[PDB]
Amino acid sequence: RFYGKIVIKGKIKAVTGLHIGSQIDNPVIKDPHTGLPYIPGSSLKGRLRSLFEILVNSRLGEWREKYPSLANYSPGSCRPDNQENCGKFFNRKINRGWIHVCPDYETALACPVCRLFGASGKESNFPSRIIVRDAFLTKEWEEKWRAGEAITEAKIEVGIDRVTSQANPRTNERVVAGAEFEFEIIYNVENTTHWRDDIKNLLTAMALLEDSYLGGSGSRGYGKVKFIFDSFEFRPLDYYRTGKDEDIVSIDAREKSVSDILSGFDSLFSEVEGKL
Amino acid sequence: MDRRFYGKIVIKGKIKAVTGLHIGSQEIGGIDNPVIKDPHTGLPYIPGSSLKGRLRSLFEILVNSRLGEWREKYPSLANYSPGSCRPDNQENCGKFFNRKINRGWIHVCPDYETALACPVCRLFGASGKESNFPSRIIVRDAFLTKEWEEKWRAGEAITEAKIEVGIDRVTSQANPRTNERVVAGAEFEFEIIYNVENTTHWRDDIKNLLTAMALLEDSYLGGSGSRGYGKVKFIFDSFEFRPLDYYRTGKDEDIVSIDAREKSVSDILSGFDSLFSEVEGKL
Amino acid sequence: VVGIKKMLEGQWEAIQPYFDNVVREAKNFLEWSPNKRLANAVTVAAYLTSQGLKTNQVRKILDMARTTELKVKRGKDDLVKMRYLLAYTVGKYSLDAFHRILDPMLEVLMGSPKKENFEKFYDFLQAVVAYHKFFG
Amino acid sequence: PKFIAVKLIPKGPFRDIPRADTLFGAIGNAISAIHGQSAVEELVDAFVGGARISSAFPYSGDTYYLPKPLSVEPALEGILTGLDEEERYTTAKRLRKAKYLDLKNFELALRLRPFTIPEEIPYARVDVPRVVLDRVTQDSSIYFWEEIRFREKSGVYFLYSGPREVFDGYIAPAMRFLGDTGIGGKSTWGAGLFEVEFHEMKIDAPGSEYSVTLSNALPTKTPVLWRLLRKGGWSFGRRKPRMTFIAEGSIVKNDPGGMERLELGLSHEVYVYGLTFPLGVELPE
């Protein structure tokens, strides 16, 4: 079942210098051909899911009525007993760490985390509704690389003994602060009832990402990512068969992640709510 | 076990160099010992590694001076003895400075459960083996203000070339040295973000973070501060608790502590219960 | 050879004075090619080492080229030329040999399009200082 | 003849270069989403009694690549008779283990005339490590993941030989839906997304009985020269059985292929594509 694809396009700005790393002694991830860094789709989706699962872990009692699959979970992880899904929220163990993943289609249909990000399950699956595309540099930040400027820099951090002041240096390649990337998130509108709650939850996790960090050291002040939204287009079900521009476009030029939910979700989206 | 989120306390202000500071790294022409700079703007900043690492250092010596007093408040401080593991090369032989990094010993709890009781490792994090307690604070990199960026446009000097000399005592021959130094008076927008993970003991972590700041206003901030290159000062612009709902509804209704023209010693000693009385009402 | 001069550098200033006077005879901006620009800079720094001049005494002039280098790179020249003269005043002696190379370059630069010729001037002045330390 | 070249311009990495059966799977999922299940029943009937697509092939800046025919291995010595015998040996095995040819050299291989291989491949298969983090106690546990990364102007195209009315209603609306979802692989990380353009390409092929397939075929009889590609698949979370396909560049003599229907215990029948895409070739003696 399909209705359209709300597409969010924006610029990701590294206000502080960013590190993701691939394993200068700690090199950041790069393209294999040009040598430029980027931000993977796995790092941005995996951070938005991690920030939003801790958001849902704190509100399991208050969201039983809106999301009926959160009545089966108690806050915590299944790590203190090496056992699969039983009562705790962080139920699925992948390799060595514990993650909320719903075990079925019918349970992940009513979870705020897994109706959006997806669930693996056994005997049934639940695919994602969002696509978090990789974020390469802007075209403006690419000719600085062509002119010869540094797009990555070497941050040398040391470790000091508390008694003797013995110093122990190390290096960390870091994408230069100020650099701008371009992101894109494509939300697949599968259900015409669930879409307002899914865009609000995606923008909530993007608002937790602006006060937390993205990749790398972070507690030492690396990530500090800012979101600028260039535009919002809807691309309805009728667009895909005829190709003519029925794209409902929500306009946001200087709007923040908070200003898109600062009563703006109900107002600006008055046409997507109209054509469903 | 059971990581939960209640919101973030964000501390914004202006680190001021009352005497000129020097952080430094190991251009073609330039002073032998230069100061770290932003690679895109060329202005000297203050890293978040250098500010968190000095606060964690000064708070660890503050614990060993009072292991008799802090032991009753926090469990797992009776797990050791005061001192370092420097003579006996052992990762856990019962001293406070238990983990070596490469050659030097730093207090790091080895397990998640002993790091949730330590005052040093709740606020700053652990990373043991199989443990990995993440930090509760983020200390951003501190760039210049919008005022002191305009001073670089107008031609006023941001840095300086301080010249020092070590004198041979017997022969009185002099060996000269030059060190780059930010001009005293320059200011830096810092930011410290505490994650309210547990509403039980958020109040102890805010008092322990502000205790370490007033220690750092007594000592220096990086690079030969026994000679004058510290004397740093926190000036608090804003103090703000962002509740969980803040990120839901996006409204700018998040509760604020004025903190105007107040010191790091005023926030703990003078009015800690008066200022934070309204944060406690929402939690 | 660039490495061969270091065996001979370690009256000898006169044999390189014809190389400096020939380079001071050509004063047009970008009059040499890319490989020829660096080949001039080896002859300059070898000449500036026989009658040796320290980088500090030059360090104020090197500051004004670099603070403008951030201001030229997506962000005047007479301020550097006024300092390049006044620093050459308090010699004592080899500051005039460094003034005979700056001031022909800076007189042409004095009226010039800013974005291109200074960025090409900045590559030559690096290699003078850069190669000066390679020999001492 | 004249073909339609559907040019897929990458927005990022691909999981794989998609075969002809995972393009027809992706087209078939795009039609039931846009139109419905009654239009998939007409999409299948238009390829059984009509149009045929190929596998996906790389290009690199208007240099379209095509698979090497399997006819040039028996007669490789016979192609290179006019060459110096001290270097016939290294020329032979370098030409033999090549995988792709461009349009100038693909035409010369169908007529068993001498040719050259490309020097650069337009992509690289890259090993990117990912991580899985515990939510509470952030324990890293890595796994390894494969991706195809393209150059700055390179990409992927596939061919279409059929009537324009079927292309305008089925294949052209599918490629705008499939540009925004993925084309096989981890599409939640932005892999498989692309921009679509349409061109026309011409191949000058000799007239004979024997013909090379530019797609997987699932042959109805014994082929002449072939390479076994053994693949299965996955259909709505149900594992498809491994079927013996034929590779791209294998040689048949009047073999249409055949579209296999697998029950698979699913709401609807699952058709696996398996059809030929012939261009005439001259075999050796």
Next chain:
RNA sequence: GUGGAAAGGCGGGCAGAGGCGGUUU
């Protein structure tokens, strides 16, 4: 009717300890 569905390269780590730009004729 897609060799698919799910998965943050991450946790902890002060560029630091010492040094009268002044001797001497």
